[PDB]
Amino acid sequence: SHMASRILLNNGAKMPILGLGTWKSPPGQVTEAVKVAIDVGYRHIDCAHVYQNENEVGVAIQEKLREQVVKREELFIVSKLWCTYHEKGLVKGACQKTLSDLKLDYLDLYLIHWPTGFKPGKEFFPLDESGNVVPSDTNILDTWAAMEELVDEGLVKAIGISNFNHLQVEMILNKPGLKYKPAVNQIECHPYLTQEKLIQYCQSKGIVVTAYSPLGSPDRPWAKPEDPSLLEDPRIKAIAAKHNKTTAQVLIRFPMQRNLVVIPKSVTPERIAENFKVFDFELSSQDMTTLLSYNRNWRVCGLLSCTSHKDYPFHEEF
Numbered sequence: 001s002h003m004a005s006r007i008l009l010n011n012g013a014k015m016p017i018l019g020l021g022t023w024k025s026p027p028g029q030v031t032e033a034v035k036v037a038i039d040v041g042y043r044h045i046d047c048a049h050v051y052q053n054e055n056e057v058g059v060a061i062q063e064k065l066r067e068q069v070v071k072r073e074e075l076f077i078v079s080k081l082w083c084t085y086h087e088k089g090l091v092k093g094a095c096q097k098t099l100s101d102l103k104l105d106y107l108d109l110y111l112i113h114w115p116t117g118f119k120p121g122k123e124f125f126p127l128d129e130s131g132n133v134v135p136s137d138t139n140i141l142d143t144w145a146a147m148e149e150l151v152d153e154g155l156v157k158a159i160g161i162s163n164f165n166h167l168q169v170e171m172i173l174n175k176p177g178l179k180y181k182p183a184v185n186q187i188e189c190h191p192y193l194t195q196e197k198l199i200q201y202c203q204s205k206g207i208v209v210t211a212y213s214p215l216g217s218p219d220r221p222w223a224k225p226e227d228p229s230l231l232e233d234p235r236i237k238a239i240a241a242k243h244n245k246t247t248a249q250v251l252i253r254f255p256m257q258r259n260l261v262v263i264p265k266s267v268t269p270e271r272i273a274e275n276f277k278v279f280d281f282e283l284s285s286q287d288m289t290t291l292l293s294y295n296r297n298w299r300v301c302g303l304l305s306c307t308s309h310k311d312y313p314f315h316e317e318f
């Protein structure tokens with residue numbers, strides 16, 4: 001369908017363009033979700049410590065390696081450093097906890113989950129008595145140097161960023177003494193948040209973009225009935241019908257044809273399989289431009305408790 005399965009990163013490794021998301025996947029369902037995903041062809045799993053389910057994801061990965069369904073070199077496992085671990089002295093241990101939970105001896109890609117650092121401690125969103133999230137004084141550049149050390153210690157094959165705006169990406173690219181460029185910027189992207197400006201910037205610098213919440217995250221905890229719904233949008237349903245595909249399949253193919261990686265989440269076996277069957281059809285340029293036209297700058301993930309943080313990413317236009 002004029003679509004290779006992997007994209008070349010600026011560390012020389014290849015990354016599968018379709019992966020399985022795991023945010024909100026219940027711990028009692030995610031082991032089977034990941035097992036099914038690997039069985040039906042997925043080779044990329046998107047994880048994070050803050051999702052609280054890496055142990056269970058790891059059970060699935062380990063079982064499929066033990067069964068010899070896949071080899072480790074064929075898998076591309078991604079995780080993310082949470083905001084309460086941006087300190088120099090905490091990054092390695094945070095990575096190692098993720099490795100130990102996923103039962104891996106390296107990650108293919110490790111991302112700074114958000115540009116905002118928070119006060120270390122047990123709470124993922126540490127609060128002051130008035131409800132503000134308590135920042136860390138550690139900046140993007142020192143956290144990046146700590147990520148570079150993980151490459152040099154063999155814990156991770158690639159490092160990258162997530163939810164960084166273009167000026168924050170530029171700050172790393174301009175970092176004095178930069179050793180490794182970010183390989184990936186993982187950002188929200190779908191027809192209601194099309195991200196043309198940030199995508200063009202990242203791609204022009206050789207940074208691969210991964211699109212998260214490609215279906216509009218209908219299970220996001222803060223969903224409201226009046227919010228727009230990609231899966232129910234009749235205009236998108238019409239494009240899907242024309243191609244004899246589901247709306248979800250169109251929503252997954254869309255970023256693929258923009259040279260993006262995409263990570264739809266499901267714990268439903270039939271949908272996991274459905275969502276992978278997107279290498280057998282092509283959207284026209286006209287379809288692509290039509291889908292782009294639906295942009296309304298609508299965000300699933302606004303990190304709304306952190307809008308005063310000095311490194312909050314979404315005040316900038318892009």
Ligand SMILES: NC(=O)c1ccc[n+]([C@@H]2O[C@H](COP(=O)([O-])OP(=O)(O)OC[C@H]3O[C@@H](n4cnc5c(N)ncnc54)[C@H](OP(=O)(O)O)[C@@H]3O)[C@@H](O)[C@H]2O)c1
Binds near residue numbers: 021211268
């Ligand atoms: N870097 C970040 O800050 C960040 C932020 C958000 C997301 N992410 C990553 O991106 C992943 C994907 O985003 P997301 O979880 O927000 O949402 P999403 O992938 O846009 O949507 C997931 C929802 O769609 C449903 N669904 C999946 N396939 C479907 C299909 N074929 N037909 C109908 N409904 C379908 C799922 O239901 P069932 O599971 O019940 O089948 C679930 O409710 C996350 O899981 C996470 O890995 C990263």
